[PDB]
Design a protein around this nucleic acid. Structure first.
Lengths: 738, 539, 517
RNA sequence: GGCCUGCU
RNA sequence: AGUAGAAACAAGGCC
């Protein structure tokens, strides 16, 4: 007998066993070197799917741009980026007609946000391409470097602390004949200048990288990271788009998994149960091929111009700027390429910027063809990427277009016996078309396809299929007369999270409880998850029960603690104690679960504020850990935990010591020292970010003066100390003025 | 003194002088976040990989003067090397367990007070009472349920000002705490934390968690209260129910159920008065709940109920997204509509004017012990599916949908003395009068509706006139389904108007609420409601 | 009152004028066109002009429609795992020491001393592209070092290895090329781009199916001892505990759990030695502690690893090591399976025989292999397989308990009446009980972790879609497609050289053959 | 031979 | 050599 697990599907349906078809217990596929090849490939593809368009030469950047909107109509079933402005505008018009007042209210909400919003929110972000160093850097580091370079050049409105003022400064930076940046070598710095064209290409360019830990594809994909100038406009656009999608019952992107399932179930039921028995009803569980490549920023500009109808002109400009920059966006090629000489047994790293000049003897035919195709578009080491979006920066506006096309089958606009409705989240859709016969169904699916190709939305035939209503799939949610649990998407969340001992324990138990709530994880499976997580925890953090003979480098302190303690059921698993967790106790931290069993000496040592291990930076990070889910976008995991001596922060990379940018560490140290002093002056600097328009020193001295006077009037401070303080206050004010 | 000396050093240093002079206070947060340290793409591999190195943890430099360089076996506990972008020093994790076996001790009596929520959770679990496991099909309904069970029903912004006034009374700003509830909460919270020495950042975080309300969509069967949702992993499954009683109850559940009862009683009185709105306002001013006044809760408390909504709107507060009808909460989800101001006759020959709506439209009916979904057209119902718990719940939903449909099959099924005016020639509302007529029993409306065929898809259940499921032919448009989606929790707070007689209306002109939709049921408050105007028995 | 004034001017005005459809020259004219735009039946007009050829015709999907999946042709596929799965041998000492309660080197010396019959090692199956005498010398070096550790008074917790030419070669030392600047190597003849081509094609072989068959088998030992949990106070906790007892009873005697423990131990040891000693080579014995059915605990030694240096920066950077494992399987009966292996002959073994004693020979499989930080992290977490499997089983059980309002764990797990198709015999499809299903899904999962690749992900997705098409057909829901032969070409695009993926494709072909009837 | 780094 | 698969590691820079 040879064993075959797939035959299990001959009795149990595929949806009631779909977890079996998910190989999510092994290493995810990773990229190893440059992502230049995929960047070039994507550029050449998105310029191929729009080749019948019109070419232009930018007077500001000098870049060759291909515009396919209102181009000829497609003649075959291949991908096409020839969207029609009139058809997009008609879709928007009918959307507003079916949901009146939606655009007005969304614009009012976004206007309020623009009036209230501040610059500090841009610190809450992912990696961002710093244009001063030409390097991916944390969002706050890039923002700070850009602000510093602006203030060094002359753009100084941002002391207002408003995002819209930072955007005004970005706009006036482009009308300057020469920026002034700084470059490090190896230790000091050097001044450099950038003519208007150079700064323009640097402000409009995007960085490219390969996407690691992606489940479900044999070939690697490229992704982009924008700079500091585009980030604010794209933030405002995504605010507007979220505000819109929230008011639409057909969108699914701004909501969670459970709300997706609720919407999907309501729609499938409505199209099945609400529709008459005479009508047939068929569900196409489809996807869109080359979704981002065909999404022109010019039709996003058209959508922004429509949605903002009869709105103030400043709001129109602020929301229009982002599509304008995306239409002219450029893409950095990548890291470069590595060349090996086997006869001479050597390797070499060429940067991508030389590709414009490099001879083509050194490349394989595939790369030779890609380089030959891209060279016309290459201007100063970056490829003009005007003809289409790169990776989901304007996700919610694309979802708005999908909901518009889904709304255009309401039966008031088709004017025919067939009609359709469904749910779309960007790059994935479920469309239930109802009609009285199979000819009506075929006509409805043909009109859906054709109306989708006139708006630059291409349907994936490779990944779409049509059956009767009752069974379908949407974003790895399998509906079969009711939704079904998968548990294989959530499997990579069942280990130690890698923050600290307390945080890993809390995150593990909370993920077990959540998977029990949402994904119908069983009781036995939840207990087993507890046990296996605890084994992995103990082996990772070297904290075994203490009544064991596991010899490690951290087995001696745990044994001394085990022997010192009288009540041994009160110790934490992080200190070598037993496990008291079970189904009843998944919602309680490990410190409160063990508080009556602890010894008072151990209880007071563990929970001590004077410990040198606990550091907390901001209220946002106190109990929140960025957790990346598999086959999904990086989420944030709230984790209930107790502040103990196990709540440390771990060490840093420490490679930057060997690089030219080693002097950034000293900047970090001084910044943190200064901010600690400011928090001393302003106790609530951590909880609530301070606001105003005053240099830090003036506030420091003013608070010092207030504190000294209050202390002298009724406090410890004596007259001599108060006089010394006020004398230094005057000395400092004079030094600051000087 | 020490801090000013540090400032002496900072102002003396040129580089510090540069940072201090150029940087503003607005950018202090940005400069707090300025770091080369990239966030870990794979934190698990990087916390699994680092825990195999000497000195994988970091600690303040005071560790050098609190812990020795090595233990009795000779293993080193800390190094002199510093972290990358910090003054902190790299230390092994054996310094942590050493701290737990030989480090300084303190008094942790403060911590139960600090982590109050967790200890109430522990105490509630320790005293809970389990019971029989009941294996049976679990109809789990996705619904918006509050998760925090000690939440003082204050929003994040609303409660951050109370947290600041408690801990940081000088940094509150212009925000004046009008509400009496906030001032009592402030004084009481101030008292417990008089000398707490843990950390003001974690004291503030604890007060935020305890005081800030939080809601989360969750599939729920059985009980919906807040004490019953924290154990949703233990009480409810896919095939099994677990009977369980919380050992304790929370002020928010009582505050909510008592506000609901108070507002219901107030509206019930105000309806029979001469000027309902004036009476309602006077009653709302002269009343309080558990000492705290009720208006504070009304501005503070988000609660879904018709009487609470009427009270809030009469106090000029924001209300729910869509209308109520027959005690159910309807939210439109497709189509437009226009009224027509038309006239028709009944089966008892009584003439009446009503407002019938245009266009095809879909609706999301909701209720307390049922749920339903409706699709209709101008004067015409298209279909209605229901997901109720008991059979009479499905009957209620079906009769409500039929009356809402304004179909002539319902108008021409009226038989008996149904007067569409009061005892004083006052025009009552026709829809509500039909809904009261068909609430004694709708035998004729069921026997006159119609019958259709079904495809027998999904195994959906058939309708019942008198308890007779029909799995192949049944009334037209009416289906029944196991499991419902709830949906309505997302709320697009709409602006509204109010008549003297408490008829709520949206910006367009349609009607949203009325004193007839509030229950006729008589409950018993959980918290003592105190009313002081002249006579203390009128509510 | 101050009126806000957000003005576009200068450069960002010109860039604004060059960002519109082609019949426009200014944002203001375009905005005026939009503000005056009123729908007048534009979509329908363009639609009619649009050619008919652009369509989404639905191709019906019937029983005769789906064809089999084509698999690649080429030389047979070779084993990729980091350790032997079914061909592994265990030396034992019967020591009452829990899973980790020991010193691996001391345990190893004790498990090797209990064997008598060692001879001078000689090569039986060479590498055919390498230098097998260096592997021989490396084995002899390991033996010398073990005897040295034995002679020394205190067994070192961690042992370092000498850096001889055999291990410098076998661990890839001074093999990377030197890194230079392009302006100093331009005119070199053979300077070219890294080789970026289709992997070598390879056809499915007979061995990944025997390996899978044996991975789903019972054994004479227990392989999982679980952490403690709290005391059960509620009835549902007792129900969960009884369910878990049944699961663990069925699953603890299974080769898949043995592979889980092997991989977890090996990856933990390799990562820790790699992070701790980055410049030194390190000897790491493969240890696993079972507990025979009588109840006595037993330690088991599979072989040795020799970690090279491990200056691993990226998560994809490779650490090389030399793996040596004991076995009884002759390498001359399936030589295509052992393409990357050198196999020596190291001893003889007398098992409990009724025909006197057999005295079967005893081989050592030696090989160079490599691993990454991410592969290590993910192989230290093979226990997740136990969760997925048991979870699915529990789902099934609850799905039946919902129908019959009573607990049904005991009937399934004891009475064995229910039977699920779990593999096809020559006579036909044969069904098995819930325990065989549990062990089969566990073995699938363990293999998926062991043989994880991008081909597997791709194939899993693209065959999930086809599985769903076949399920829609099975439910009589008149299913249809738009391009099915292309979908097949997309599935077949992932079958290149991986044994596990080719086996999954064979399983899918068999399922399509036996379904659709 | 001596130090630095292991996502920069 | 080996890992791995559309480009990388098989150590890198500084004295």
């Amino acid at each position: 007998m040879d064993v075959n697990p797939t035959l299990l599907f001959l009795k149990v349906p595929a949806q009631n066993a779909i977890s079996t078809t998910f190989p999510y217990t092994g290493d995810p596929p990773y990229s190893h070197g440059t992502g230049t090849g995929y960047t070039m490939d994507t550029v050449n593809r998105t310029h191929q799917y729009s080749e019948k368009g019109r070419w232009t030469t930018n007077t500001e950047t000098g870049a060759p741009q291909l515009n396919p909107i209102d181009g000829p109509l497609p003649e075959d079933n291949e991908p096409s980026g020839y969207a029609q402005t009139d058809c997009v505008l008609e879709a928007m018009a009918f959307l507003e007609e079916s949901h009146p007042g939606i655009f007005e209210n969304s614009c009012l909400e976004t206007m309020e946000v623009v009036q209230q919003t501040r610059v500090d929110k841009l610190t809450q972000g992912r990696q961002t391409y710093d244009w001063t160093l030409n390097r991916n850097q944390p969002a706050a580091t890039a923002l700070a470097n850009t602000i510093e370079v602006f203030r060094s050049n002359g753009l100084t409105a941002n002391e207002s602390g408003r995002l819209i003022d930072f955007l005004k400064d970005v706009m006036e930076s482009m009308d300057k004949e020469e920026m002034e940046i700084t470059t490090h070598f190896q230790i000091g710095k050097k001044k450099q200048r950038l003519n208007k064209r150079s700064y323009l290409i640097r402000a409009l360019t995007l960085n490219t990288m390969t996407k690691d830990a992606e489940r479900g594809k044999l070939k690697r994909r490229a992704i982009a990271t924008p700079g500091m100038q585009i980030r604010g406009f794209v933030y405002f656009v995504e605010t507007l788009a979220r505000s819109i999608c929230e008011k639409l019952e057909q969108s699914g992107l701004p909501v969670g998994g459970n709300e997706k399932k609720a919407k999907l179930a309501n729609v499938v039921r409505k199209m099945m149960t609400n529709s008459q028995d005479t009508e047939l009803s068929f569900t196409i569980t489809g996807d869109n091929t080359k979704w981002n490549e065909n999404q022109n920023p010019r039709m996003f500009l058209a959508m922004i111009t429509y949605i903002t109808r009869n709105q103030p002109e400043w709001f129109r400009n602020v929301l229009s700027i982002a599509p304008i920059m995306f239409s002219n966006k450029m893409a950095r090629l990548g890291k470069g390429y590595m060349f090996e000489s086997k006869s001479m047994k050597l390797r070499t790293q060429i940067p991508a910027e030389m590709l414009a000049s490099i001879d083509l003897k050194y490349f394989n035919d595939s790369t030779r063809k890609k380089i030959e195709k891209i060279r016309p578009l290459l201007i100063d080491g970056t490829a003009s990427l005007s003809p289409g979006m790169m990776m989901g920066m304007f996700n919610m506006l694309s979802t708005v277009l999908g909901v518009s096309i889904l709304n255009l089958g309401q039966k008031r606009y088709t004017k025919t016996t067939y009609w359709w409705d469904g749910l779309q989240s960007s790059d994935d859709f479920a469309l239930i078309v109802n009609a009285p016969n199979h000819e009506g169904i075929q006509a409805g699916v043909d009109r859906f396809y054709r109306t989708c190709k006139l708006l630059g939305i291409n349907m994936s035939k490779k990944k779409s299929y049509i059956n009767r209503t009752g069974t379908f799939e949407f974003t790895s949610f399998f509906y079969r007369y009711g939704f079904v649990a998968n548990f294989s998407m959530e499997l990579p969340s069942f280990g130690v999270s890698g923050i600290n001992e307390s945080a890993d324990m809390s995150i593990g138990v909370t993920v077990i409880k959540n998977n029990m709530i949402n994904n119908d994880l069983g009781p036995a499976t939840a207990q087993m998850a507890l046990q296996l997580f605890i084994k992995d925890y103990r082996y990772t953090y070297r904290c075994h029960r203490g009544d064991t003979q596991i010899q490690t480098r951290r087995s001696f302190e745990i044994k001394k603690l085990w022997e010192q303690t009288r009540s041994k059921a009160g110790l934490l698993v992080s200190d070598g104690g037993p496990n008291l967790y079970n189904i009843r106790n998944l919602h309680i931290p490990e410190v409160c679960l063990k508080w009556e069993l602890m010894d008072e000496d151990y209880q007071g040592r563990l929970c001590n504020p004077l410990n040198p291990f606990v550091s907390h930076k901001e209220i946002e990070s106190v109990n929140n850990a960025v957790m990346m889910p598999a086959h999904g976008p990086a989420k944030n995991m709230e984790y209930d935990a107790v502040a103990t001596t196990h709540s440390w922060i771990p060490k840093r990379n420490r490679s930057i010591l060997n690089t030219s940018q080693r002097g950034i560490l000293e900047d970090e140290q001084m910044y943190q020292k200064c901010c600690n002093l400011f928090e001393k002056f302003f106790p609530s600097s951590s909880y609530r970010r301070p606001v105003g328009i005053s240099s830090m020193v003036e506030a420091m001295v003013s608070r010092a003066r207030i504190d000294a006077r209050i202390d002298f009037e009724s406090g410890r401070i004596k007259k001599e100390e108060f006089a010394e303080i006020m004398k230094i206050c005057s000395t400092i004010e004079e030094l600051r003025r000087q | 003194m020490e801090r000013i000396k540090e400032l002496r050093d900072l102002m003396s240093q040129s580089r510090t002088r540069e940072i201090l002079t150029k940087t503003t206070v607005d950018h202090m947060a940005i400069i707090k976040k300025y770091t080369s340290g990239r966030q870990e793409k794979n934190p698990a591999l990087r916390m699994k990989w680092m825990m195999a190195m000497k000195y994988p943890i970091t600690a303040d430099k005071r560790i050098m003067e609190m812990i020795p360089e090595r233990n009795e076996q000779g293993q080193t506990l800390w190094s002199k090397t510093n972290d990358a972008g910090s003054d902190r020093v790299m230390v092994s994790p054996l310094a942590v367990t050493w701290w737990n076996r030989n480090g300084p001790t303190t008094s942790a009596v403060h911590y139960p007070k600090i982590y109050k929520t967790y200890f109430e959770k522990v105490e509630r679990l320790k005293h809970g009472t389990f019971g029989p496991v009941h294996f049976r099909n679990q109809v789990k309904i996705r619904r918006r349920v509050d998760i925090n069970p000690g939440h003082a029903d204050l929003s994040a912004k609303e409660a951050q000002d109370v947290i600041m006034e408690v801990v940081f009374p000088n940094e509150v700003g212009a925000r004046i705490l009008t509400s009496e509830s906030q001032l009592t909460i402030t004084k009481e919270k101030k008292e417990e934390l008089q000398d707490c020495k843990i950390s003001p950042l974690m004291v503030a975080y604890m007060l935020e968690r305890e005081l800030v309300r939080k809601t989360r969509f969750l599939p729920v069967a059985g009980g919906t209260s807040s004490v019953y949702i924290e154990v949703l992993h233990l009480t409810q499954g896919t095939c099994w129910e677990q009977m369980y009683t919380p050992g304790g109850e929370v002020r928010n559940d009582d505050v909510d159920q008592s506000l609901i009862i108070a507002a219901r009683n107030i509206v019930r009185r105000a309806t029979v008065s001469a000027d309902p709105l004036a009476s309602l306002l006077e009653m709302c001013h002269s009343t309080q709940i558990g000492g705290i006044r009720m208006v504070d809760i009304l501005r503070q408390n988000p609660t879904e109920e018709q009487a609470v909504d009427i009270c809030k709107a009469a106090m000029g507060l924001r209300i729910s997204s869509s209308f109520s009808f027959g005690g159910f909460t309807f939210k439109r989800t497709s189509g437009s509509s226009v009224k027509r101001e038309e006239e028709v006759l009944t089966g008892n020959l009584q003439t009446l004017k009503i407002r019938v709506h245009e266009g095809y439209e879909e609706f999301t009916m909701v209720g307390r012990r049922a749920t339903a979904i409706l699709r209709k057209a101008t004067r015409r119902l298209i279909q209605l599916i229901v997901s109720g718990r008991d059979e009479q719940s499905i009957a209620e939903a079906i009769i409500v949908a039929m009356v809402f449909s304004q179909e002539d099959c319902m108008i021409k099924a009226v038989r008996g003395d149904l007067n569409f005016v009061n005892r004083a020639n006052q025009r009552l509302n026709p829809m509500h009068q039909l809904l009261r007529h068909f609430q004694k029993d709708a035998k004729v409306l069921f026997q006159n509706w119609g019958i259709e065929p079904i495809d027998n898809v999904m195994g959906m259940i058939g309708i019942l006139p008198d308890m007779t499921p029909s799995t192949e032919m049944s009334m037209r448009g009416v289906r029944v389904s196991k499991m419902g989606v709830d949906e309505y929790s997302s709320t697009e707070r709409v602006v509204v108007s109010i008549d003297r007689f408490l008829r709520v209306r949206d910006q367009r002109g349609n009607v949203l609420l009325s004193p007839e939709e509030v229950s006729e049921t008589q409950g018993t408050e959980k918290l003592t409601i105190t009313y002081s105007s002249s006579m203390m028995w009128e509510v | 009152t101050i009126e806000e004034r957000f003005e576009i001017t200068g450069t960002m005005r010109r860039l604004a004028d060059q960002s519109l459809p082609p019949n426009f020259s200014s944002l203001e004219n375009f905005r005026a066109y939009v503000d005056g735009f009123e729908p007048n039946g534009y979509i329908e007009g363009k639609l009619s002009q649009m050619s008919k050829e652009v369509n989404a015709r639905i191709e019906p999907f019937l029983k005769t429609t789906p064809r089999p999946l084509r698999l690649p042709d080429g030389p047979p596929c070779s084993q990729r795992s980091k350790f032997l799965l079914m061909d592994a041998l265990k030396l034992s000492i019967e020591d009452p020491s829990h899973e980790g309660e020991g010193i691996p080197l001391y345990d190893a010396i004790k498990c090797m001393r209990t064997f008598f019959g060692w001879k001078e090692p000689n090569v039986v199956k060479p590498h055919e592209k390498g230098i097998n005498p260096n592997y021989l010398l490396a084995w002899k070096q390991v033996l010398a070092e073990l005897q040295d550790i034995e002679n020394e008074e205190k067994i070192p917790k961690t042992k370092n290895m000498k850096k001889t030419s055999q291990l410098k070669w076998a661990l890839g030392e001074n093999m990377a090329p030197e890194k230079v600047d392009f302006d100093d190597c331009k005119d070199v003849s053979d300077l070219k781009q890294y080789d970026s081509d289709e992997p070598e094609l390879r056809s499915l072989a007979s061995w990944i199916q025997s390996e899978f068959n044996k991975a789903c088998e019972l054994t004479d030992s227990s392989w999982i001892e679980l952490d403690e949990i709290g005391e059960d106070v509620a009835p549902i906790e007792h129900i969960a505990s009884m369910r878990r007892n049944y699961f663990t009873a069925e699953v603890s005697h299974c080769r898949a759990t043995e592979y889980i423990m092997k991989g977890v131990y090996i990856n933990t040891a390799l990562l820790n030695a790699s992070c701790a000693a980055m410049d030194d080579f390190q000897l790491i014995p493969m240890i696993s502690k079972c507990r025979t059915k009588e109840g006595r605990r037993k330690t088991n030694l599979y072989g040795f690893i020799i970690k090279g240096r491990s200056h691993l920066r990226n998560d994809t950077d490779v650490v090389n090591f030399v793996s040596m494992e004991f076995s009884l399987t002759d390498p001359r009966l399936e030589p295509h399976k052992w393409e990357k292996y050198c196999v020596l002959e190291i001893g003889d073994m007398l098992l409990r025989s009724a025909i006197g004693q057999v005295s079967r020979p005893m081989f050592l499989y030696v090989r160079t292999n490599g691993t990454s930080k991410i592969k290590m992290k993910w192989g230290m977490e093979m226990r997740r397989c136990l969760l997925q499997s048991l979870q699915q089983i529990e789902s099934m059980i609850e799905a039946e308990s919902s129908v019959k309002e009573k607990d049904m764990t005991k009937e399934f797990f004891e009475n064995k009446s229910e039977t699920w198709p779990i593999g096809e015999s020559p006579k036909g499809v044969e069904e098995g009980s819930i325990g065989k299903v549990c062990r089969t899904l566990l073995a699938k999962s363990v293999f998926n972790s062991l043989y994880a690749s991008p081909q597997l992900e791709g194939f899993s997705a693209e065959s999930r879609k086809l599985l769903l098409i076949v399920q829609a057909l099975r439910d009589n829901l008149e299913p249809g497609t738009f391009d099915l032969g292309g979908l097949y070409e997309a599935i077949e695009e992932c079958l290149i050289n991986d044994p596990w993926v080719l086996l999954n494709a064979s399983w899918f072909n068999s399922f399509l053959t036996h379904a659709l009837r």
